[PDB]
């Protein structure tokens, strides 16, 4: 028993002292308190009118009010008891406070958040548990912890720095380690020369000291000094602040690369008071909430049946058992004489532990089985993240899968499910595996979908999964035979996709302490664990508990992104993978941000280490949050399988950004909504279209169209008023909108507009994935001092089938250039592109620079598309700039005569090789291609774990390993560098052999 003094609400404040059963539940304690208050209370009428469900239990832990939220938790495990014992408090005080209705302002803020998210997080219509409300309550602690510890000025100004070394192609441009900076204030400009290692503070101090005599001109109030001002990129919002050398800001680098002057304006710092956060609504929820305890406390052995309150899961030695009652759909999908049957499978990740199925029956509108399916697996061997995978197969008179649904077998509170269930199944519209097939959510449409009724057994007491006790492990040993060590090393050195034979698994698990010394063997050593046996799991936790080498190992993103895949569903492998990502810079979390957001789809539980890591890194930088918001909102609007989890995460984020960051999000979701209704109306219904659009656009300025908003794909650029004399509708099947705004910042150095393409009726997520991979590949090439002059433009998906795309100025499609002379027949002259480029560039030096740029760009885009396997493109999807750069567009689809990549005789003519002749430029092109290919091969594991994800969370249609082996074949895994060089040169000759043979066939296919 435990003495506790509850402070009741009725007044002086009445108190009740009670003794609580240690192993009882919170609901039991509530009932006992209510029963005592019914008698002790002077006025029991107040307690008779209401009940125990109209009050909250709050306790103060170090100046903050925590709440006992779980109405079943074991009283013994309440963290309040531990806190009191540490402080030597007895009896503890627990305040009982009555529930109140939310104020009006709370409801208004909630509605605003729901509007921003695009989904009602407060809905409880499609749920069979309280996992999502419990996650909302739990995520309060990380948000407060991160908000409290943020530097106001650095948050408000978000400098964009990096620590990587300066690539060699940039040290040539820095002469004598000095950089020229142009400093504007008002109508005055001055060029200063500074050292490349000077922090912005030193730069200012030097400036002021120089111009101290002439401060009057610059218009710097005499009473003000270098501490009142900051530097700001002219035109954009990219403050240069903090303690960092001038050479480490991504702006300065970018400007150097492009050979452009660095223009900076003196400005006043933003006031951090604009980033105040609304006071938290809910009290914090006790930390030890999802904690169950150890086996010794939970076991039923060595106890009396009258003293049993919980049963350990590891005490059940029976075989699992599920009852299939029946299936039922309102209307048959297909009309024929068909047989159907149900298949149940236990599943861990992608592994099918067991499998049972029922006898076929004719496919009527309601099929009834009432059959107990028994699985070979015992109830004690069930692992945390298992998933009963119910599937409906149809046979004629093989079998074709029709519907699927998943049900967890251990909830977020470490308890075994029980009772009847009625689950609404998804439909396999459209391969062997996809991410969509792991979701544990049910179909929202409850009126026109198939439903499976199951029944899991009921038990007298809750059955809980104990917690592995961290006990010292016995294992010593000695050296390994030099044959077995060589065999093990050979096993470890294989590519990530090489399957493992049973002998390999046995060898890895036998010498599981030698493998622990090599980090690279972790992704294979954890694939050989028999997750269907409790003993081997408790032996795996005793091994993971000694994690010295992994902690001391250097960070490799290609290895740590391999433990987050769908193969590992254990929370302790993922936990360490995240512990290893928590040391990544802020410049490198932006490269892999989209992959890490897509990797949340593989998490069996809503609350996870990876979700908390994204939440924390979002609340710390003001540029990793602009993109987390738009990725989560792009996923919510389209993926009905995972919209509720992303909605919860996005709500958790949006309650800590600030008021400015919410104003911006609002002023952008408005622009977007207005331009999507415009698009819709335009399509629904020549000069017609022209005038119609002009009208609508000019009348949107009589609505509430924001006059200044941040471009969604470039958070640093502010766009203002439309230029309605430059907009139009592009000539295409889907009629994109060609909008052109103008910069809202009056400090800009030019009158150039901001071009934006608004698309509708198409999904752009695949474009985003491909562009992210291109940026990753350009970082890899930068690592080795290679400048292939790629041009990944800005693309972003904003909602359902809609999107926004950047416009590249002075660019045109190669198809238009060909049609400018040939016409629209299907012929292709070979010298058109060269003549066009020469016309654009009259000066010889400009022409040579453009041709070199062309060369490099083509080499890099051929290599990239060959590696990705999407190099077979129509000539209409490749554009070229007036400076010679070349790039691809419209990747949203590509994801009997075939080519590896587009190298039509026009490119080769630009280079100089008219036929099979060779020229200096085509030799330079070959050398660049070979170097780039070898550099890419250096990161084979990374690119092989990024492609697999691109495919499992990308294209909606299911995929098989045959789809993934292409990347293995393209990178020439396991071959010497000479062999790879020969292979790529052979591919080049293959493209140099077909000429216009595939282009013509694309033209014919499109015309026909």
């Amino acid at each position: 028993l435990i003495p506790i003094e509850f402070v009741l609400p009725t007044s002086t404040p009445e108190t009740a002292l009670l003794h609580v059963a240690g192993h009882g539940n919170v609901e039991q304690m509530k009932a006992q308190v209510w029963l005592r208050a019914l008698e002790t209370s002077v006025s029991a009428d107040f307690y008779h009118r209401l009940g125990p469900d109209h009050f909250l239990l709050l306790y103060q832990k170090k100046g903050q009010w925590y709440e006992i939220y779980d109405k079943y938790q074991v009283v013994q495990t309440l963290d309040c008891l531990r806190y009191w014992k540490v402080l030597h408090r007895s009896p503890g005080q627990i305040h009982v406070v009555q529930r109140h209705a939310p104020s009006e302002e709370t409801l208004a803020f909630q509605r605003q958040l729901n509007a921003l998210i695009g989904y009602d997080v407060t809905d409880v219509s499609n749920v069979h548990d309280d996992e999502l409300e419990f996650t909302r309550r739990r995520l309060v602690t990380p948000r407060m912890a991160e908000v409290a510890g943020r530097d106001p000025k650095l948050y408000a100004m978000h400098p964009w720095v990096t620590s990587k070394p300066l690539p060699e192609y940039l040290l040539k441009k820095i002469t004598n380690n000095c950089v020229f900076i142009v400093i504007h204030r008002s109508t005055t400009s001055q060029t200063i020369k500074v050292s490349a290692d000077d922090t912005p503070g030193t730069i200012l101090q030097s400036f002021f000291t120089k111009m101290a005599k002439k401060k009057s001109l610059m218009d710097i109030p005499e009473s003000q000094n270098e501490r009142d001002f900051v530097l700001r990129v002219c035109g954009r919002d990219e403050y240069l602040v903090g303690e960092t050398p001038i050479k480490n800001f991504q702006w300065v680098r970018q400007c150097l690369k492009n050979g452009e002057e660095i223009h900076l304006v003196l400005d006043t710092p933003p006031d951090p008071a604009l980033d105040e956060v609304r006071k938290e609504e809910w009290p914090l929820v006790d930390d030890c909430t999802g904690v169950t305890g150890y086996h010794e406390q939970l076991t039923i052995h060595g106890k009396d049946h009258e003293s049993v309150f919980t049963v350990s899961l590891w005490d059940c030695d029976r075989k699992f058992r599920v009852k299939i009652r029946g299936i039922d759909i309102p209307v048959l999908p297909r009309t024929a004489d068909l047989t159907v049957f149900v298949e149940a499978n236990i599943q861990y990740g992608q592994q099918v532990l067991c499998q049972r199925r029922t006898s076929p029956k004719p496919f009527t509108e309601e099929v009834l089985w009432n059959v107990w399916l028994e699985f070979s697996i015992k109830i004690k061997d069930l692992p945390k993240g298992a998933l009963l995978n119910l599937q409906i197969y149809c046979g004629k008179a093989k079998a074709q899968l029709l519907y699927y649904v998943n049900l967890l077998l251990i909830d977020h509170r470490f308890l075994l499910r029980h009772g009847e269930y009625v689950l609404h199944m998804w439909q396999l519209s459209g391969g062997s595996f996809n991410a969509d097939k792991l979701t544990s959510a049910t179909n929202p449409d409850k009126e026109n979908s198939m439903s499976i009724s199951i029944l899991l057994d009921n038990y007298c007491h809750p059955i809980a999964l104990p917690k592995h006790r961290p006990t010292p492990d016995p294992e010593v040993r000695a050296e390994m035979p030099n044959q077995l060590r060589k065999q093990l090393e050979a096993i470890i050195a294989t590519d990530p996709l090489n399957p493992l034979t049973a002998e390999d698994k046995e060898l890895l698990w036998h010498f599981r302490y030698e493998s622990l010394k090599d980090p690279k063997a972790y992704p294979k050593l954890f694939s050989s664990v028999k997750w269907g046996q409790q003993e081997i799991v408790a032996k795996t936790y005793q091994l993971l508990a000694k994690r010295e080498v992994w902690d001391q190992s250097a960070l490799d993103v290609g290895l740590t992104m391999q433990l987050l895949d769908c193969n590992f569903s254990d929370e302790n492998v993922r936990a360490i993978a995240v512990q290893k990502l928590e040391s990544l810079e802020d410049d490198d979390v932006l490269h892999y941000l989209l992959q890490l957001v897509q990797a949340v789809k593989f998490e069996p539980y809503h609350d996870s280490a990876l979700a908390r890591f994204l939440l924390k890194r979002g609340l710390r930088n003001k540029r990793i949050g602009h993109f987390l918001f738009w990725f989560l909102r792009s996923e919510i609007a389209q993926s009905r399988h995972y919209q509720q989890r992303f909605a919860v995460i996005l709500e958790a984020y949006l309650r800590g950004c600030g008021t400015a960051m919410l104003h911006d999000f609002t002023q952008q979701v408005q622009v977007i909504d207005m331009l999507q209704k415009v698009t819709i109306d335009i399509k629904s219904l020549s000069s017609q279209v022209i005038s119609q659009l002009k009208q609508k656009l000019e009348n949107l300025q009589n609505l509430n169209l924001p006059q200044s908003f941040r471009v969604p794909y470039d958070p640093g650029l502010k766009a203002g008023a439309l230029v309605i004399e430059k907009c139009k509708v592009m000539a295409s099947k889907k009629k994109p909108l060609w909008l052109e705004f103008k910069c809202a910042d009056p400090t800009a150095l030019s009158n150039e507009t901001i071009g934006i393409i608004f698309k509708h009726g198409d999904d752009l997520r695949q474009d985003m994935l491909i562009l992210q991979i291109l940026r990753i590949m350009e970082s890899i090439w930068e690592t080795e001092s290679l400048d292939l002059c790629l041009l990944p433009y800005g693309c972003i998906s904003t909602g359902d089938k809609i999107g926004m795309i950047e416009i590249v100025k002075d660019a045109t499609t190669i198809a238009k250039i060909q049609q400018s002379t040939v016409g629209n027949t299907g012929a292709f002259k070979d010298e058109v592109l060269s003549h066009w480029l020469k016309e654009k560039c009259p000066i010889e030096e400009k022409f040579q620079a453009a041709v070199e740029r062309f060369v490099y760009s083509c080499a890099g885009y051929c290599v990239a598309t060959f590696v990705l396997g999407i190099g077979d493109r129509h000539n209409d999807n490749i554009m070229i700039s007036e400076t010679g750069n070349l790039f691809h567009i419209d990747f949203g689809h590509i994801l009997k005569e075939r080519v590896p990549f587009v190298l039509t005789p026009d490119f080769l003519f630009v280079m100089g090789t008219s036929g099979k002749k060779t020229s200096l430029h085509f030799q330079k092109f070959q050398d660049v291609c070979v170097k780039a290919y070898l550099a890419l091969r250096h990161h084979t594991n990374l690119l092989i774990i990024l492609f697999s994800m691109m495919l499992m969370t990308g294209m909606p249609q299911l995929t098989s390993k045959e789809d993934i082996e292409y990347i293995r074949d393209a990178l020439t895994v396991g071959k010497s560098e000479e062999d790879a060089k020969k292979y790529f040169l052979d591919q080049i000759e293959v493209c140099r052999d077909k000429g216009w043979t595939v282009q013509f066939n694309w033209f014919l296919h499109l015309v026909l």
Binding site: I300, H305, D328, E366, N370
Partner: protein
């Protein structure tokens, strides 16, 4: 040995058939020593099930244990059989409902029997004989509702024999004292001397002695520690025997011979049931005022047609009383069905009932009492409600369980534009209403989770096409106050007429079963 293998054969032949249990309970009773051997074998078999997982063989074993452990003449102090049984049944807490709920109630009985020997047999006997004390008084009475005609004469002879007052309070109190003393002091007591000395004593002193013995046993059952409870009970009984004046009867260093004490026949009353309503019971309750929680064991000897009207009478005595408590005022009723539909249904669920009850002093008397005594778990029947709105505005809620016609055939047993609306439903709790009227002659509601009635439709529209379908709920409305009869489970007496609107929808005194 031969005896052990005989017992094992009987056990393996009762767990496969109606008199295969009675034969066990008639082979064991011979020697007081046969009750331990049987228990060991049962425990062995139980452990096997625990290892295997045979969900279907648990409930019969839990009934044999309870049955034997309650007649065991005596447990030697050395024997640890009860402890082994408790350890064996402790591991069923991890099984699914209701097995865990049969095991908790067996473990409680095994602690009550571990601490206070003979308590579970003195409670039963006490109650059934209505010879309780002034502290914990209870009672049980058995009424044999049997139809003189429909039922065979053999069951009449059995009922007559069971109705003969068997014991007297004097003999019952002597038997209770003898079994309370033997259970505790084993062979170390002299039951012949105890009986001879108890015979001459008066009724009042015997009642006082039993009241002290029962109070001591009850208090001993409350003791926390098991080990000291037996010694405390032994000392208390020794003092009681010293006070009563036969100290030279207990603790005899010389050992005697164990004797088996059977359960005395319970009190029974036989009443002529020519009707079907359960009003008879309230008429009986007048002599209960003079014949006085408690309990009443109503043994409704049962036929087929009877079953229908028996459920109908059950109906009233269910709701009627729930709303007009008259019998429930004192007694908790429990009805027992003797097969002489309800049968079929109660068998498909609980085999032990089928195998035993359905397969059926004389052997029939023993088996009857045995069933009535040990079967203690109910099965709720599946009934359907009907609302019959009449022309003058009369609405009557009937409750049928077999069938229900309405039409030309309803008059025949004693064609219209009958509006018909029906609502089927799926296992997922989604309904699919339908409002299709068909002009027809006869409509028969046929008893096809829950159960979905079937709608019969006889569309013989002739000048000068009978269809049946499933239905979860039905509504048959008449054509502008047009008369039509209403059958009731193939009734031949109560068939009303001129009805207009009839809606049929799916719908203590339990129907006790063993499991």
């Amino acid at each position: 040995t031969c005896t052990e293998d005989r017992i094992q054969h009987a056990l393996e032949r009762c767990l496969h058939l109606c008199l295969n249990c009675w034969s066990l309970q008639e082979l064991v009773s011979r020697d007081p020593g046969h009750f331990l051997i049987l228990l060991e074998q049962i425990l062995q078999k139980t452990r096997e099930v625990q290892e295997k997982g045979t969900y279907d063989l648990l409930a019969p074993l839990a009934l044999l244990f309870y049955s034997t452990v309650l007649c065991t003449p005596h447990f030697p102090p050395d024997s640890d059989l009860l402890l082994k049984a408790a350890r064996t049944y402790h591991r069923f807490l991890t099984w699914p409902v209701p097995y865990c709920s049969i095991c908790q109630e067996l473990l409680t009985f095994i602690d009550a029997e571990l601490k206070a020997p003979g308590i579970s047999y003195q409670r039963l006997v006490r109650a059934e004989q209505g010879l309780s004390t002034r502290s914990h008084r209870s009672s049980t009475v058995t009424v044999l509702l049997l139809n003189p005609v429909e039922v065979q004469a053999e069951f009449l002879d059995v009922a007559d024999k069971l109705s003969t007052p068997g014991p007297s309070p004097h003999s019952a109190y002597i038997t209770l004292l003898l079994h309370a003393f033997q259970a505790t002091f084993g062979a170390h007591c002299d039951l012949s001397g105890l009986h001879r000395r108890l015979q001459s004593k008066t009724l009042a002193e015997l009642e006082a002695i039993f009241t002290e013995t029962a109070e001591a046993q009850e208090l001993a059952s409350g003791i926390g520690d098991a080990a000291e409870a037996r010694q405390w009970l032994r000392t208390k009984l020794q003092a009681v025997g010293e006070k009563a004046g036969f100290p030279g009867v207990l603790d005899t260093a010389k050992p005697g011979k164990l004797r088996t004490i059977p359960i005395p026949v319970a009190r029974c009353y036989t009443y002529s049931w020519n009707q079907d309503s359960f009003d008879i019971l309230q008429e009986i309750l007048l002599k209960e005022q003079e014949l006085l929680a408690s309990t009443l064991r109503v043994v409704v000897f049962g036929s087929d047609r009877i079953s229908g009207k028996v459920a109908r009478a059950y109906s009233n005595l269910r709701r009627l009383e729930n709303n007009r408590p008259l019998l429930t005022r004192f007694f908790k009723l429990q009805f027992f069905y003797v097969p002489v539909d309800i049968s079929h249904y109660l068998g498909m669920l609980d085999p032990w009932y089928e195998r035993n009850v359905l397969g059926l002093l004389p052997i029939l008397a023993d088996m009857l009492l045995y069933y009535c005594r040990f079967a203690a778990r109910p099965v709720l029947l599946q009934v359907y409600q009907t609302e019959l709105t009449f022309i003058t505005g009369e609405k009557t809620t009937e409750i049928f369980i077999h069938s229900l016609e309405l039409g030309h055939s309803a008059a025949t047993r004693a064609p219209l534009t009958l509006q018909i609306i029906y609502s089927k439903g799926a296992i997922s709790g989604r309904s699919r209403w339908s409002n299709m009227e068909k002009l027809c002659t006869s409509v028969n509601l046929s008893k096809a989770s829950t159960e979905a009635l079937t709608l019969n439709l006889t569309e013989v529209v002739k000048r000068q096409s009978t269809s049946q379908i499933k239905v979860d709920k039905v509504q048959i409305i008449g054509s502008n106050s047009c008369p039509f009869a209403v059958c009731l489970d193939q009734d031949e007496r109560k068939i009303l007429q001129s009805v207009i609107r009839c809606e049929v929808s799916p719908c203590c005194l339990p129907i006790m079963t063993f499991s």
